[PDB]
Design an enzyme around this catalytic site. Structure first.
Site, mmCIF file in Angstrom:
data_model
loop_
_atom_site.group_PDB
_atom_site.id
_atom_site.type_symbol
_atom_site.label_atom_id
_atom_site.label_comp_id
_atom_site.label_asym_id
_atom_site.label_seq_id
_atom_site.Cartn_x
_atom_site.Cartn_y
_atom_site.Cartn_z
ATOM 1 N N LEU A 1 0.841 -1.186 0.000
ATOM 2 C CA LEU A 1 0.000 0.000 0.000
ATOM 3 C C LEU A 1 0.879 1.239 0.000
ATOM 4 O O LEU A 1 1.955 1.248 0.604
ATOM 5 C CB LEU A 1 -0.925 0.021 1.218
ATOM 6 N N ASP A 2 0.416 2.285 -0.673
ATOM 7 C CA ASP A 2 1.127 3.554 -0.678
ATOM 8 C C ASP A 2 1.362 4.034 0.743
ATOM 9 O O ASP A 2 0.801 3.490 1.692
ATOM 10 C CB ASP A 2 0.346 4.610 -1.456
ATOM 11 N N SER A 3 2.195 5.056 0.890
ATOM 12 C CA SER A 3 2.403 5.664 2.188
ATOM 13 C C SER A 3 1.157 6.476 2.531
ATOM 14 O O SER A 3 0.743 6.525 3.716
ATOM 15 C CB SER A 3 3.657 6.532 2.189
#
Ligand SMILES: CCCCCCCCCCCCCCCCCC(=O)OC[C@H](COP(=O)([O-])OCC(O)COP(=O)([O-])OC[C@@H](COC(=O)CCCCCCCCCCCCCCCCC)OC(=O)CCCCCCCCCCCCCCCCC)OC(=O)CCCCCCCCCCCCCCCCC
Ligand SMILES: CCCCCCCCCCCCCCCCCC(=O)OC[C@H](COP(=O)([O-])OCC[N+](C)(C)C)OC(=O)CCCCCCCCCCCCCCCCC
Ligand SMILES: CCCCCCCCCCCCCCCCCC(=O)OC[C@H](COP(=O)(O)OCCN)OC(=O)CCCCCCCCCCCCCCCCC
Ligand SMILES: CCCCCCCCCCCCCCCCCC(=O)OC[C@H](COP(=O)(O)OCCN)OC(=O)CCCCCCCCCCCCCCCCC
Ligand SMILES: CCCCCCCCCCCCCCCCCC(=O)OC[C@H](COP(=O)(O)OCCN)OC(=O)CCCCCCCCCCCCCCCCC
Ligand SMILES: C[C@H](CCC(=O)O)[C@H]1CC[C@H]2[C@@H]3[C@H](O)C[C@@H]4C[C@H](O)CC[C@]4(C)[C@H]3C[C@H](O)[C@]12C
Lengths: 547, 90, 173, 459, 88, 127, 57, 171
Positions: free
Chosen positions: E42-44
């Site tokens: 998952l993205d930050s």
């Protein structure tokens, strides 16, 4: 006489005994809160007995039992006055406190200083009955500054919090600024008349009394949180909710009005002051109510509801209707105490959350609390034949049909409308709509103490106004003949207020972005009076000090 | 050097590091201070025989006020000293 | 407090309406009044009789001090301390008594205000009339002397008043 | 008065001849008894003062100041024995001797019937006072502040001597009773103006008046607890008592020679009360409170009205008990944290519950909560200065508003908040410390039940 | 306050319960040690939104600085226990 | 949307602070430097704070300096400084002069009325 | 309990109580020198009672 | 500092919460939340660090005139209703060393365990002192972090106060 005088003083001595048993004896710790609650339970019944006698035959007493000090031609006695205002107010204050002392047993069960809290609640009540029954100005000051201290000690109940300590000092600072007016009146009467007793003041009736009345009005401006000295009443919500219900909304704040109701014999002649009290009330009722709409914390909203009403009492004083303002004080106590006690159930069930934005969907989860939250809210706005109707309606009738300031007459009505808008906002956000509080549900109000306390004041918010209005003796020539629209101006604006409110709530549902309006920001930030004045004044006084 | 008085003695009243003296020092302070000078000192002041004639003045004025009211004389006259005795200049 | 001398501390005769209940409902105050008399008035009244019986058993008397009039400061030679001391202590006693006279005439004015209820502004003209005279007499006697007031200063104020009063009378003629 | 002077003298043989360990028990227990017999000085008559001999009399103005003086000695022994536990016995006994010597001069000072006898005993007090404050004083900081004495003696004590001597050659006596019956008006004149300043400047410095006050904060920082208790409680009152007596022979010049001083005191109240807010040291904050309170006493004395004189007498007695109570409470902390900084220790109410109560009562009486005699005094001064000029209610009102702020700001900072984490030596309060506070505030509160005894000779 | 007791097991369930309802993540892949950047990928940014959700589950803010250092469910659970002093 | 107009009592937010946006090696070193001093002080304090045997006060030297600097007497200042010392002279003997005429005139007016009977003091008995 | 060593300890306690007696006695002795106007003041001058030496002492 | 990576992220959380306050109702917040997410992901791929900064400059400036005047604050968080509320009840542990022995008899078992814990601290201190000395870079530590224990039965340096801090709701 025998029964009236004896039982007038058992009430005052009955309340002190719980205080006395704290200092000595050791018969019962652990069960102190219920011991105190019974004292007020009995002190109320004993206080009704003189009230019935006053209704029956209008009997009135002065009791000056003790001679304390004789400063040459000035004699100070411990004089109690059991007259129209004392007899009616004491049962009302005791009845309201009775429930709160029972609502505190639940709201403050875990706190280990529960016994200390009940000692301070009682010590306030003692300094309030002293204020109302006082017959001379010096004895009035003991109550005047007695309540002021007990606010400090209770507002800052949680003394670890830095905001609590700031809010307590703020309460003292504004009241003591007002108490410059109180001493000015005290100095004037001694210098120009010769007594601090009220009897001699009314007997002489000075024709030129502009200075003493400004001083008296200034005390009410600070004690009752009128405009210019109002920021402390909102910020005084930092204390435990039972404190805010018993002190800063039901009783203590009325003492500012109660001082002017005491001195009607003088203020009736002085028109020049009547204008000031009318103007002073007119701005405060609008300003605070205007601020009430955009607030987001349930305690804060109900705090501004107190200020807006208190201004309506100040206008009643101005329009030369002192006996109505007294009726408004008594009727106002019931439903405003119930509001806070109900908001106490919400906050305690939602795990110490005061923001209405995170409340909702409680209309079915908390039946009893919701019913009262409706009953109380309807009284405030002016629902016909509720406790609030018997007082607010007449006040609007007498304002409309009297020689008055035009702008002041208009501001009162506008503020009465606003009283409708934020009566709903509590209901709409807190009672209606889907829930918005955190997931884990612990909403439980099935306790006898919280219920019995709410139940009793709920009855008061219904029938107390009808009983009080009927029984009390006539004192003025009421105006019952007026144009139909002026007669129902109160109801129409209340109705017009609701319509606008409900439309505004629905617009909040619609998926349209939020747009900042200067009128909106001015409302939410309280007009920037707290921000500017609590920054410029502290900075200047502290900085000037070093020089 | 900040020596806790409690460490050596857990019942110290703070007066002395000597337990025997420490208890006696407390008793005279609490006895002479509270038992004698405050309790009896309060009783003495309470029953002071008519301080500065405040009581006597009220009895005197009552007797004067009664007398002057019946006989028709004024309650109080403006001139304190009988004007006959005075001799104004010129 | 043998009994407040009615002349000094007068009260007008009491006129109380007789009970005239037209309605049929019971009157609680009448019931409570009887309960109070039995529960409070009598057991207390018995106690006061037990105390009073013993008080009359041992009866001893106290008296009200009498002070001979002595020559006033007007008869004292300049700087003759023994004459001034007699004159000065006497004046202080009268200054103290005259203060309790004003209080008595104040206590009347405050009792009338309460007793006459809402009509007080009319039915207390005599009480207000007496209070204004005593105040004026007191003001001329003792006002403005200062914290270090004395008989010599009271005399000087009087002698100043008489000169201005005397002079004024001439100007009229 | 010999019934009090002699037994006070016999405290010195008592201290020296006692068992080494029983000096505090004897001196405190027998200095307490002397105070008990001092309630016989309330045998006051309405018309005449209580005159015992050719040398000493006792009227209503000196009776409370005498009872306060002899009540304080046993308190000053309890307050000081803890920090004198280290030092050797012979040095210990001398400290008690200086306190017994101070009482002996003070009881003779307040009752002296002749003004030179008053003056000499008025300056003899400084001898024990300075030894206590410099020899046992906690501060060796080296002030060079003797210039405040050089200012005081040159501008205060010396002119008082030349004027008092001058007056006797003219009036013929300095017996106070005689001056009551022989006083003559003080005609306007440049020579009389200098007589007025000579007779008052000595007492104005000791009050202290605004502008001449800077010595008091410094003296309180140096002095031990005993030095501050006597200094704030009594020695400031010697100036007040001196001005109440000596204004008898200064009329009517006081009418126009008191304008410059009232403007210092009235404006002085606001300046020092505001400075209290910004103070960082307790003893300086309490020291500046005294200057703000005594500023009322100076105004009350100089407007010379029957109500003001009752006000000043109540304030002088009420302030004495309150301020010495505050100095003791400040010393209780210093005896722990070992610093006089206010900010150092905070939230102390969490660790010392009962001590926080004493702080609350001491603060309430300082901010003048009715019906305490602290307000009976202040109210009367406010009532009378209102007649003097209605505008003064502005300055009197503001001083009440500020006074509540440092009164409670001191309470909030030291007793409320989060405790300082690293301070771990806040041992529980001793019975000595709790008994000491109770002996300041039990008498102070009981005086409200019978306030006539402290209202002075104008009552 | 009635009784809102918290225990590690209960906290663990609630944290996972919230995690499962996040559509970007799969129910079965999720586990106590599932590093968000890697195991769940998952993205930050999405890491922020997970934090903001957890605040509301327990109603107490997680400081910005400490939110960053949280990157797996097991980290979050023990953080809650620390702040709320959950010991058994 | 006008930028935030800072004032003495209205601080400029960090988010809108122009400087914070661009931190270079010079800035990075400084903040690391500040952290270095801060880190060292934290170490010195924590050793004494956590020391089991300490029962006392960790005297903070910075506090002592603050109290010493605030509680200053005459070691600074020069007597004839017109820009500052004179401004001190006005703020000191200035207000005392103002209140002099505020109270002198008022008591003059009252006395003159009393000397003419104009002032009404019908019940003025307590003074 | 032995008289000596009980007296070697508390003999100091009599100093102040004795001092009061000495002071009180001397204060009575000083009134006698001021008996010039005893029973001669205008305010309290009166004839004596048959068995009373003087009005006050 | 915090680097452009963190600095932007914080704005996301702060901007979201204010939005959540403004919209009030959950549904409107969710929808308006997604729009916000779009604006963030739009320039998430900007590889020009110089340009990336400029987006933040305007981004924050936009936020300054979007912020709700009263943003919701968690009750037990700084600026919230309950913040510091219970600090009065939190009594530091060392106060127990002053209890009267008669009092300590009321709680024997707990005080017995306390003696065990105190003994652990005293003995570990000397070891704990060394560990910081050796690891410390001469010239003063550059960061405030601490090193975990590097031996069995050794406690991490400076552990007393973090371990024994007063509970969240002591009473
Ligand atoms: C006066 C009212 C004070 C009420 C009170 O108790 O509050 C103290 C209370 C102290 O307790 P706390 O801090 O709240 O919490 C409990 C404490 O932890 C500790 O308290 P506690 O409850 O745990 O322990 C018992 C209690 C008391 O402990 C005791 O045992 C008391 C013993 C000392 C009292 C001695 C009095 C008698 C003096 C001796 C001489 C007379 C007897 C001789 C006569 C012989 C017979 C003729 O402890 C204390 O209160 C400590 C202070 C007690 C002395 C205070 C001075 C009185 O503090 C306050 O409430 C401050 C008062 C705030 C203002 C309220 C009043 C404002 C309005 C003014 C009213 C004016 C009325 C008078 C005019 C009409
Ligand atoms: C409701 C609560 C209960 C009611 C309680 C009220 C009744 C209590 C009894 C009462 O009123 O008291 C009666 C009296 C006051 O009432 P009174 O003046 O009417 O007298 C009562 C007695 N008769 C009727 C005969 C006159 O109480 C006192 O006088 C107490 C005096 C205390 C002041 C003295 C303090 C001690 C002095 C010793 C030295 C310590 C001070 C050091 C020096 C300080 C500087 C001066
Ligand atoms: C406040 C109420 C208490 C009043 C009081 O303390 O009693 C004083 C009173 C003295 O009467 P008074 O003429 O007013 O004297 C004033 C002088 N300061 O005292 C009295 O006159 C009567 C006192 C006797 C009361 C008898 C009842 C005692 C009840 C048992 C004790 C409980
Ligand atoms: C002032 C009037 C006194 C003038 C005397 C000055 C010289 C006194 C002196 O310096 O003596 C110091 C002496 C120290 O000697 P020390 O080692 O303490 O011996 C044991 C003490 N009991 O300690 C002493 O001073 C002991 C003598 C104290 C004085 C009081 C003794 C009580 C009995 C006699 C009364 C003397 C009154 C003087
Ligand atoms: C240095 C000298 C200062 C001036 C003192 C002086 O000259 O006094 C003059 C005056 C002489 O008058 P005399 O002879 O006593 O009576 C006949 C009437 N011409 O002397 C007198 O009559 C009375 C003398 C009073 C005592 C004078 C004390 C000298 C100090 C006077 C200044 C006091 C104020 C100090 C400054 C305070 C701060 C402003
Ligand atoms: C008078 C009696 C002392 C004798 C005893 O120890 O039993 C004490 C003991 C416990 C006390 C009781 C408790 O304080 C509380 C009881 C419950 C209600 O509050 C009414 C008062 C109440 C009934 C009190 C009356 C009285 O003070 C009691 C009954």
């Amino acid at each position: 006489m025998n029964m009236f005088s004896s039982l007038s003083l058992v009430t005052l001595l009955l309340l002190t005994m719980p205080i006395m048993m704290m200092s000595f004896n050791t018969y019962k710790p652990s069960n102190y809160p219920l011991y105190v609650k019974t004292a007020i339970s009995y002190a109320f019944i004993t206080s009704m007995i003189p009230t019935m006698m006053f209704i029956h035959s209008g009997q009135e007493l002065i009791i000056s039992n003790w001679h304390w000090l004789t400063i040459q031609t000035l004699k100070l006695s411990l004089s109690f006055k059991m007259d129209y205002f004392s007899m009616m107010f004491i049962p009302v204050a005791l009845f309201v406190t009775w429930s709160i002392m029972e609502f505190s047993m639940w709201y403050m069960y875990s706190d280990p200083n529960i016994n200390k809290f009940f000692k301070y609640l009682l010590l306030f009540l003692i300094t309030m009955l002293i204020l109302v029954t006082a017959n001379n100005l010096f004895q009035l000051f003991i109550g005047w500054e007695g309540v002021g201290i007990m606010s400090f000690l209770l507002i800052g109940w949680w003394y670890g919090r830095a905001d609590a300590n700031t809010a307590a000092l703020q309460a003292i600072l504004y009241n003591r600024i007002g108490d410059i007016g109180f001493i000015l009146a005290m100095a004037w009467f001694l210098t120009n008349l010769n007594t601090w007793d009220l009897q001699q003041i009314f007997m002489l009736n000075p024709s030129d009394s502009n200075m003493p009345l400004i001083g008296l009005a200034l005390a009410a401006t600070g004690k009752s949180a009128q405009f210019g000295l109002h920021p402390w009443l909102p910020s005084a919500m930092e204390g435990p909710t039972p404190v805010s219900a018993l002190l800063h909304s039901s009783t203590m704040v009325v003492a500012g009005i109660f001082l002017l109701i005491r001195f009607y014999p003088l203020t009736e002649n002085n028109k020049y002051i009547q204008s000031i009290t009318l103007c002073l009330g007119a701005i405060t009722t609008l300003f605070t109510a205007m601020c009430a709409l955009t607030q987001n914390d349930i305690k804060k909203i109900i705090a501004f509801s107190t200020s807006s009403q208190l201004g309506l009492m100040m206008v009643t004083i101005g329009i030369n209707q002192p006996y109505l303002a007294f009726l408004h004080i008594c009727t106002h106590a019931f439903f405003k105490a119930m509001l806070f006690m109900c908001s106490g159930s919400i906050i305690h069930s939602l795990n110490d959350e005061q923001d209405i934005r995170k409340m909702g969907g409680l209309f079915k989860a908390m039946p009893f609390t919701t019913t009262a939250l409706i009953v109380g809210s309807l009284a405030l706005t002016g629902m016909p034949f509720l406790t609030g109707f018997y007082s607010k309606d007449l006040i609007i009738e007498a304002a409309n049909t009297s020689y008055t300031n035009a702008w002041a007459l208009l501001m009162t009505l506008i503020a009465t409308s606003f009283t409708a808008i934020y009566s709903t906002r509590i209901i709409f956000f807190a009672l209606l709509g889907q829930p918005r509080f955190p997931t884990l549900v612990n909403i439980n109000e099935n306790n006898p103490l919280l219920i019995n306390s709410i139940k009793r004041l709920l009855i008061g918010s219904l029938f107390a106004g009808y009983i009080i209005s009927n029984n009390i003796p006539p004192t003025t020539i009421p105006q019952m003949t007026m144009p139909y629209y002026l007669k129902t101006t109160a109801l129409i604006v209340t109705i017009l207020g609701f319509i606008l409110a409900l439309e505004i709530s629905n617009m909040t549902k619609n998926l349209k972005y939020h747009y900042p309006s200067n009128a909106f920001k001015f409302s939410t930030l309280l007009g920037y009076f707290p921000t500017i004045m609590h920054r410029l004044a502290p900075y200047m006084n502290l900085s000037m000090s070093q020089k | 050097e900040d020596e806790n008085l409690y460490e050596k003695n857990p019942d110290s009243h703070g007066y002395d590091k000597d337990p025997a003296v420490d208890i006696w020092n407390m008793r005279v302070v609490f006895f002479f201070g509270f038992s004698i000078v405050l309790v009896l000192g309060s009783t003495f002041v309470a029953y002071l025989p008519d301080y500065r004639m405040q009581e006597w003045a009220r009895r005197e004025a009552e007797r004067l006020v009664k007398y002057r009211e019946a006989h028709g004389l004024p309650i109080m006259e403006s001139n304190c000293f009988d004007p006959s005795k005075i001799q104004l200049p010129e | 407090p043998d009994s407040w001398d009615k002349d000094v501390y007068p009260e007008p005769p009491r006129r109380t309406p007789a009970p005239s209940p037209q309605t049929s409902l019971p009157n609680p105050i009448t019931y409570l009044t009887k309960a109070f008399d039995l529960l409070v008035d009598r057991p207390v009244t018995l106690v006061r009789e037990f105390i009073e019986r013993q008080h009359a058993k041992n009866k001893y008397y106290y008296y009200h001090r009498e002070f001979r009039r002595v020559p006033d400061i007007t008869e004292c030679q300049e700087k003759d301390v023994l004459c001034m001391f007699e004159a000065e202590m006497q004046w202080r006693r009268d200054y103290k008594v005259d203060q309790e006279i004003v209080n008595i005439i104040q206590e009347r004015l405050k009792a009338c205000q309460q007793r006459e209820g809402e009509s007080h502004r009319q039915n207390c003209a005599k009480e207000l009339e007496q209070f204004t005279q005593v105040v004026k007499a007191y003001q001329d006697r003792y006002h403005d002397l200062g914290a270090h007031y004395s008989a010599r200063k009271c005399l000087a104020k009087q002698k100043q008043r008489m000169l201005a009063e005397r002079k004024a009378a001439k100007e009229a003629a | 008065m010999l019934k009090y002077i002699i037994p006070t003298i016999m405290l010195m043989p008592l201290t020296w001849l006692s068992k080494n360990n029983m000096i505090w028990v004897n001196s405190t227990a027998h200095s307490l008894l002397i105070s008990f017999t001092s309630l016989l000085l309330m045998n006051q008559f309405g018309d005449n003062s209580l005159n015992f001999s050719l040398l000493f009399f006792s009227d209503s103005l000196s009776t409370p100041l005498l009872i306060l003086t002899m009540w304080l000695l046993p308190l000053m022994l309890m307050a000081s024995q803890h920090h004198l536990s280290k030092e050797n016995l012979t040095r210990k006994k001398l400290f008690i001797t200086m306190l017994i010597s101070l009482q002996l001069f003070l009881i003779m000072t307040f009752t002296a019937m002749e003004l030179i006898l008053f003056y000499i005993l008025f300056e003899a007090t400084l001898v024990p006072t300075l030894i206590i404050i410099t020899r046992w004083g906690n501060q060796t900081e080296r002030l060079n502040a003797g210039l405040y004495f050089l200012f005081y003696t040159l501008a205060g004590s010396l002119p008082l001597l030349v004027a008092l001597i001058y007056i006797q050659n003219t009036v013929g006596s300095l017996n106070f009773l005689m001056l009551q019956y022989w006083v003559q008006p003080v005609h306007n004149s440049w020579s009389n103006v200098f007589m007025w300043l000579a007779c008052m400047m000595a007492f104005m410095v000791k009050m202290p008046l605004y502008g001449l006050h800077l010595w008091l904060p410094k003296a309180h920082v140096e002095a031990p607890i005993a030095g501050s208790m006597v200094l704030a409680a009594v020695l400031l009152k010697l100036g007040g008592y001196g001005m109440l007596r000596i204004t008898l022979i200064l009329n009517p010049m006081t009418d126009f020679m008191a304008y410059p001083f009232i403007m210092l005191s009235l404006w002085g109240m606001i300046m020092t009360s505001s400075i209290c807010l910004r103070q960082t040291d307790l003893k300086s904050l309490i020291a500046y409170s005294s200057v703000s309170h005594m500023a009322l006493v100076i105004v009350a004395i100089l407007i010379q009205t029957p109500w003001s004189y009752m006000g000043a007498t109540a304030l002088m007695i009420a302030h004495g008990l309150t301020s010495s109570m505050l100095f003791c409470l400040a010393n209780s902390n210093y005896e722990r944290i070992h610093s006089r900084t206010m900010i150092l220790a905070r939230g102390l109410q969490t660790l010392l519950p009962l001590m926080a109560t004493w702080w609350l009562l001491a603060s309430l009486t300082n901010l003048a909560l009715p019906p305490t005699i602290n307000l009976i005094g202040e109210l009367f001064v406010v009532m009378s200065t209102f007649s003097w000029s209605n505008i003064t209610i502005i300055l009197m009102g503001v001083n009440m508003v500020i006074t509540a702020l440092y009164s409670l700001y001191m309470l909030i900072m030291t007793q409320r908040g989060k405790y300082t984490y690293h301070i771990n030596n806040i041992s529980p309060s001793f019975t000595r410390e709790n008994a000491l506070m109770s002996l300041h505030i039990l008498p102070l509160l009981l005086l409200t039940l019978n306030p006539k005894i402290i209202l002075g000779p104008l009552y | 306050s009635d009784a809102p007791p918290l225990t590690l097991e209960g906290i663990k369930d609630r944290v996972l319960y919230v995690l499962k309802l996040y559509d970007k993540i799969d129910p079965e892949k999720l586990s106590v040690n599932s590093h968000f950047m890697k195991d769940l990928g998952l993205d930050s940014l999405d890491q922020v939104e997970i934090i903001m959700a957890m605040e509301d589950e327990f109603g107490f803010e997680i400081p910005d600085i400490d939110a960053e250092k949280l990157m797996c469910p097991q980290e979050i659970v023990d953080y809650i226990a620390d702040k709320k002093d959950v010991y058994e | 949307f006008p930028k935030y107009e800072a004032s003495r009592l209205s601080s400029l937010p960090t988010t809108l602070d122009p400087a914070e946006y661009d931190i270079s090696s010079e800035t990075r070193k400084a903040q690391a430097e500040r952290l270095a001093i801060r880190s060292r002080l934290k170490r010195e304090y924590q050793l004494q704070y956590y020391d089991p045997s300490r029962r006392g006060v960790i005297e903070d030297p910075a506090l002592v300096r603050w109290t010493y600097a605030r509680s200053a007497n005459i070691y600074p200042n020069f007597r004839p400084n017109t820009k500052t010392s004179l401004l001190g002279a006005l703020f000191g003997i200035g207000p005392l002069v103002f209140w002099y005429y505020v109270f002198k005139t008022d008591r003059d007016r009252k006395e003159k009325l009393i000397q003419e009977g104009k002032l009404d003091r019908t019940f003025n008995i307590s003074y | 309990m032995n008289l000596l060593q009980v007296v070697r300890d508390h003999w100091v306690h009599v100093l102040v109580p004795m001092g009061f007696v000495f002071g009180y006695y001397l204060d009575r002795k000083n009134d006698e020198k001021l008996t010039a106007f005893r029973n001669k003041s205008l305010l309290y001058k009166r004839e004596l009672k048959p068995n009373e030496e003087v009005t006050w002492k | 500092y915090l680097t452009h990576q963190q600095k932007v992220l914080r704005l996301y959380k702060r901007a979201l919460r204010h939005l959540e306050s403004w919209c009030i109702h959950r549904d409107k917040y969710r929808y308006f939340a997604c729009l916000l997410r779009a604006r963030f992901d739009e320039h998430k791929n900007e590889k020009d660090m110089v340009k990336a900064t400029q987006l933040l400059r305007e981004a924050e400036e936009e936020f300054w005139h979007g912020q709700h005047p009263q943003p919701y604050i968690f009750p037990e968080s700084p600026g919230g209703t309950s913040y510091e509320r219970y600090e009065c009840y939190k009594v530091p542990e060392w106060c127990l060393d002053d209890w009267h022995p008669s009092e300590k008899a009321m709680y024997p078992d707990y005080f017995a365990k306390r003696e065990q814990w105190k003994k652990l601290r005293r003995e570990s201190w000397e070891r704990e002192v060394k560990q910081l000395q050796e690891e410390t870079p001469v010239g003063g530590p550059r960061t405030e972090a601490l090193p975990p224990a590097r031996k069995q039965g050794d406690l991490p340096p400076l552990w007393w106060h973090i371990v024994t801090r007063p509970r969240e709701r002591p009473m």
